[PDB]
Amino acid sequence: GMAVTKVTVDGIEFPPTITPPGSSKSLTLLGAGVRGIEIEAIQIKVTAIGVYAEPEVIASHLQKWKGKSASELVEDDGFFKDLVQAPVEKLVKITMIKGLTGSQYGGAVEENIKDRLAALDKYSEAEEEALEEFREFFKTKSFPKGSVIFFHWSSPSTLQISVSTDGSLPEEAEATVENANVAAALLDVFLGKNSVSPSTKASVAEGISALLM
Ligand SMILES: [Cl-]
């Protein structure tokens, strides 16, 4: 259904619902957490991550996981696979805890995606082109402390990206990357076996367990 309570990550509030930029639908918060980004081996930067999906992911697509505890879901790789494969709209909201240039952020996440694609043997030139669109978008942006990125999977292969320096929710999506493998790999970056954020995965297992009841 629809979550009622916000989750706060390093002081940053994630609301229990969000309407993706340009969208009419409201997505429910599933969980939130943190990850680190390495800049030149001398700096580790932190981002806060919030994971949202259509309410329907609970009512329909994750019914087989009913009655499991959070502490039963977090170790089950099949559970997170079902989540990332669910045919529903999803949104990941990123807040910059301290500042990054667009190229700094974009480059780090691009490498996360590339590494996942190579592990799957799905890093050809269709994906290479898509990742350059991804890189080119982020190179133009600035992410001072408190800025936000909205990654919106509006379809299984359609990644809509929006940003705002003041943390406000944009009225429309700004860029779109259409590539099935890149879209799926970015979901894996956050929620897969090799996730950059065990804390987000644990929170999402808790939030889904609660919603399933
Ligand atoms: Cl991130």
Tab-separated table of C-alpha atoms and ligand atoms in Angstrom:
chain	number	residue	atom	x	y	z
A	1	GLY	CA	0.000	0.000	0.000
A	2	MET	CA	1.210	3.504	0.829
A	3	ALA	CA	3.868	4.117	3.492
A	4	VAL	CA	2.885	6.625	6.155
A	5	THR	CA	6.207	7.512	7.763
A	6	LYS	CA	9.285	9.281	6.439
A	7	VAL	CA	12.754	7.755	6.783
A	8	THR	CA	15.570	10.082	7.820
A	9	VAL	CA	19.104	9.371	6.563
A	10	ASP	CA	21.964	11.315	8.152
A	11	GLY	CA	19.387	13.998	9.000
A	12	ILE	CA	17.923	14.037	5.484
A	13	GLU	CA	14.182	13.326	5.353
A	14	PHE	CA	12.750	11.054	2.697
A	15	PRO	CA	8.972	11.527	2.372
A	16	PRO	CA	6.765	8.408	2.412
A	17	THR	CA	5.430	9.228	-1.069
A	18	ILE	CA	6.757	10.927	-4.194
A	19	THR	CA	5.284	11.842	-7.557
A	20	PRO	CA	8.071	11.418	-10.131
A	21	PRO	CA	8.717	14.552	-12.216
A	22	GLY	CA	6.250	14.683	-15.119
A	23	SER	CA	4.312	11.779	-13.662
A	24	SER	CA	0.771	11.554	-12.329
A	25	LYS	CA	1.394	8.460	-10.248
A	26	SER	CA	2.415	8.512	-6.602
A	27	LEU	CA	5.118	6.063	-5.582
A	28	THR	CA	5.533	4.702	-2.055
A	29	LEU	CA	8.776	4.835	-0.101
A	30	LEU	CA	10.241	1.359	0.344
A	31	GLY	CA	13.398	2.262	2.227
A	32	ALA	CA	16.468	4.443	2.341
A	33	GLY	CA	20.169	4.337	3.172
A	34	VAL	CA	23.640	5.585	2.271
A	35	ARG	CA	26.547	4.899	-0.045
A	36	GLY	CA	30.093	6.149	-0.455
A	37	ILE	CA	31.715	7.572	-3.539
A	38	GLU	CA	35.489	7.515	-3.906
A	39	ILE	CA	37.071	10.646	-5.381
A	40	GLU	CA	40.766	10.220	-6.305
A	41	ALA	CA	41.431	7.635	-3.545
A	42	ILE	CA	41.812	10.475	-1.008
A	43	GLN	CA	38.150	11.467	-0.476
A	44	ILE	CA	35.049	9.463	0.279
A	45	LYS	CA	31.803	11.330	-0.342
A	46	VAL	CA	28.420	10.233	0.996
A	47	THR	CA	25.045	10.204	-0.661
A	48	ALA	CA	21.641	9.426	0.802
A	49	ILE	CA	19.437	7.080	-1.242
A	50	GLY	CA	15.633	6.722	-1.156
A	51	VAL	CA	13.885	3.878	-3.035
A	52	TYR	CA	10.268	4.312	-4.203
A	53	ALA	CA	7.908	2.117	-6.245
A	54	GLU	CA	4.258	1.827	-7.224
A	55	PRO	CA	2.061	0.588	-4.324
A	56	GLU	CA	1.083	-2.241	-6.658
A	57	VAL	CA	4.513	-3.817	-6.140
A	58	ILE	CA	3.193	-4.879	-2.712
A	59	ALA	CA	-0.405	-5.801	-3.557
A	60	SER	CA	0.525	-7.923	-6.588
A	61	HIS	CA	4.131	-8.535	-7.460
A	62	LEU	CA	5.695	-9.388	-4.094
A	63	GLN	CA	2.876	-11.461	-2.592
A	64	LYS	CA	5.025	-14.596	-2.456
A	65	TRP	CA	7.190	-12.872	0.187
A	66	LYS	CA	4.295	-12.335	2.622
A	67	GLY	CA	4.868	-13.348	6.238
A	68	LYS	CA	8.644	-13.036	5.974
A	69	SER	CA	10.465	-10.765	8.413
A	70	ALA	CA	12.815	-7.988	7.340
A	71	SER	CA	15.529	-10.224	8.755
A	72	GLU	CA	14.260	-13.006	6.493
A	73	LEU	CA	14.200	-10.869	3.369
A	74	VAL	CA	17.632	-9.162	3.518
A	75	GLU	CA	19.661	-12.347	2.891
A	76	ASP	CA	17.372	-13.595	0.157
A	77	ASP	CA	18.986	-12.609	-3.157
A	78	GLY	CA	15.883	-13.906	-4.925
A	79	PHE	CA	13.753	-11.371	-3.065
A	80	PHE	CA	15.736	-8.393	-4.317
A	81	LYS	CA	15.796	-9.927	-7.791
A	82	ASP	CA	11.977	-10.048	-7.703
A	83	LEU	CA	11.964	-6.418	-6.618
A	84	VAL	CA	14.247	-5.103	-9.336
A	85	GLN	CA	12.416	-7.194	-11.955
A	86	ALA	CA	8.925	-6.122	-10.861
A	87	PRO	CA	7.065	-4.519	-13.787
A	88	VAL	CA	6.246	-1.282	-11.978
A	89	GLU	CA	7.533	2.294	-12.034
A	90	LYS	CA	10.403	2.917	-9.615
A	91	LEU	CA	12.288	5.979	-8.440
A	92	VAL	CA	15.583	6.389	-6.633
A	93	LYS	CA	16.126	9.771	-5.009
A	94	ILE	CA	19.735	10.768	-4.310
A	95	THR	CA	20.678	13.587	-1.927
A	96	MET	CA	24.252	14.914	-1.856
A	97	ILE	CA	25.400	15.022	1.742
A	98	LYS	CA	28.436	17.072	0.639
A	99	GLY	CA	29.162	18.578	-2.741
A	100	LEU	CA	30.141	16.946	-6.010
A	101	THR	CA	30.612	18.231	-9.526
A	102	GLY	CA	28.355	16.578	-12.076
A	103	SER	CA	31.305	14.779	-13.657
A	104	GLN	CA	32.404	13.509	-10.253
A	105	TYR	CA	29.010	12.010	-9.448
A	106	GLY	CA	28.181	10.885	-12.964
A	107	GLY	CA	31.563	9.265	-13.470
A	108	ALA	CA	31.359	7.292	-10.263
A	109	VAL	CA	27.891	5.904	-10.983
A	110	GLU	CA	28.785	5.280	-14.638
A	111	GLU	CA	31.623	3.042	-13.454
A	112	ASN	CA	29.216	1.248	-11.108
A	113	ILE	CA	26.947	0.581	-14.062
A	114	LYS	CA	29.783	-0.448	-16.405
A	115	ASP	CA	31.124	-2.906	-13.821
A	116	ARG	CA	27.691	-4.502	-13.501
A	117	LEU	CA	27.237	-4.728	-17.279
A	118	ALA	CA	30.641	-6.371	-17.697
A	119	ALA	CA	29.786	-8.915	-14.980
A	120	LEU	CA	26.710	-9.788	-17.064
A	121	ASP	CA	28.599	-9.709	-20.375
A	122	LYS	CA	26.238	-6.972	-21.542
A	123	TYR	CA	28.682	-4.127	-22.163
A	124	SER	CA	28.539	-3.590	-25.928
A	125	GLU	CA	28.222	-0.353	-27.855
A	126	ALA	CA	24.480	0.132	-27.518
A	127	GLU	CA	25.190	0.316	-23.766
A	128	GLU	CA	28.323	2.349	-24.388
A	129	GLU	CA	26.233	4.945	-26.261
A	130	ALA	CA	23.664	4.984	-23.474
A	131	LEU	CA	26.345	5.511	-20.837
A	132	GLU	CA	27.752	8.419	-22.831
A	133	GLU	CA	24.294	10.008	-22.838
A	134	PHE	CA	24.302	9.433	-19.073
A	135	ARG	CA	27.780	10.965	-18.685
A	136	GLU	CA	27.029	13.898	-20.942
A	137	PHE	CA	23.923	14.763	-18.929
A	138	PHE	CA	25.727	14.767	-15.623
A	139	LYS	CA	28.792	16.703	-16.858
A	140	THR	CA	26.614	19.807	-17.242
A	141	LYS	CA	25.303	19.689	-13.677
A	142	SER	CA	26.489	20.879	-10.280
A	143	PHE	CA	25.694	19.031	-7.070
A	144	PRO	CA	26.404	21.256	-4.093
A	145	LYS	CA	25.545	19.954	-0.649
A	146	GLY	CA	21.793	19.338	-0.461
A	147	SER	CA	21.253	18.881	-4.194
A	148	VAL	CA	19.077	16.016	-5.398
A	149	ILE	CA	18.967	13.585	-8.340
A	150	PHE	CA	15.760	11.784	-9.324
A	151	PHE	CA	16.272	8.522	-11.228
A	152	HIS	CA	12.868	7.453	-12.516
A	153	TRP	CA	12.333	4.090	-14.178
A	154	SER	CA	9.162	5.051	-16.042
A	155	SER	CA	9.417	1.753	-17.950
A	156	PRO	CA	11.777	-1.254	-17.707
A	157	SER	CA	14.089	0.355	-20.291
A	158	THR	CA	13.274	4.058	-19.824
A	159	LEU	CA	15.402	5.984	-17.312
A	160	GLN	CA	14.202	9.539	-16.752
A	161	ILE	CA	16.637	11.798	-14.903
A	162	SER	CA	15.995	15.137	-13.194
A	163	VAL	CA	17.993	17.248	-10.760
A	164	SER	CA	17.556	20.226	-8.485
A	165	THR	CA	20.217	22.129	-6.567
A	166	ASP	CA	17.842	23.213	-3.789
A	167	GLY	CA	16.279	19.805	-3.251
A	168	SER	CA	12.909	20.747	-4.758
A	169	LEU	CA	10.939	18.270	-6.858
A	170	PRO	CA	11.201	19.196	-10.582
A	171	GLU	CA	8.020	19.728	-12.603
A	172	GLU	CA	9.282	17.606	-15.493
A	173	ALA	CA	11.943	15.048	-16.351
A	174	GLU	CA	15.005	16.580	-17.967
A	175	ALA	CA	16.852	13.720	-19.664
A	176	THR	CA	15.891	10.251	-20.789
A	177	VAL	CA	18.173	7.289	-21.425
A	178	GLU	CA	16.453	4.436	-23.268
A	179	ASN	CA	18.423	1.266	-22.785
A	180	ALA	CA	17.166	-1.915	-21.162
A	181	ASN	CA	20.528	-3.167	-19.934
A	182	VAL	CA	21.672	0.182	-18.467
A	183	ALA	CA	18.314	0.726	-16.733
A	184	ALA	CA	18.424	-2.721	-15.146
A	185	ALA	CA	22.095	-2.427	-14.212
A	186	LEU	CA	21.539	0.864	-12.364
A	187	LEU	CA	18.783	-0.788	-10.326
A	188	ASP	CA	21.290	-3.523	-9.538
A	189	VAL	CA	23.796	-0.909	-8.360
A	190	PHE	CA	21.368	0.015	-5.594
A	191	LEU	CA	19.505	-3.227	-4.939
A	192	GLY	CA	21.496	-6.100	-6.445
A	193	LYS	CA	23.787	-8.731	-4.966
A	194	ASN	CA	26.732	-6.355	-5.289
A	195	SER	CA	24.822	-3.267	-4.100
A	196	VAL	CA	26.744	-0.146	-3.180
A	197	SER	CA	24.345	0.257	-0.257
A	198	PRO	CA	23.692	-2.646	2.159
A	199	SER	CA	21.901	-0.104	4.353
A	200	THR	CA	19.396	0.754	1.627
A	201	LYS	CA	18.782	-2.970	1.013
A	202	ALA	CA	18.169	-3.596	4.708
A	203	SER	CA	15.789	-0.630	4.941
A	204	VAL	CA	13.919	-1.737	1.833
A	205	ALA	CA	13.509	-5.253	3.251
A	206	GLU	CA	12.047	-3.696	6.396
A	207	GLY	CA	9.741	-1.348	4.506
A	208	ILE	CA	8.428	-4.053	2.193
A	209	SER	CA	7.949	-6.501	5.080
A	210	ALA	CA	5.895	-3.873	6.895
A	211	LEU	CA	3.847	-2.965	3.812
A	212	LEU	CA	3.110	-6.628	3.067
A	213	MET	CA	1.279	-6.637	6.407
B	1	CL	CL	24.381	7.395	-5.369
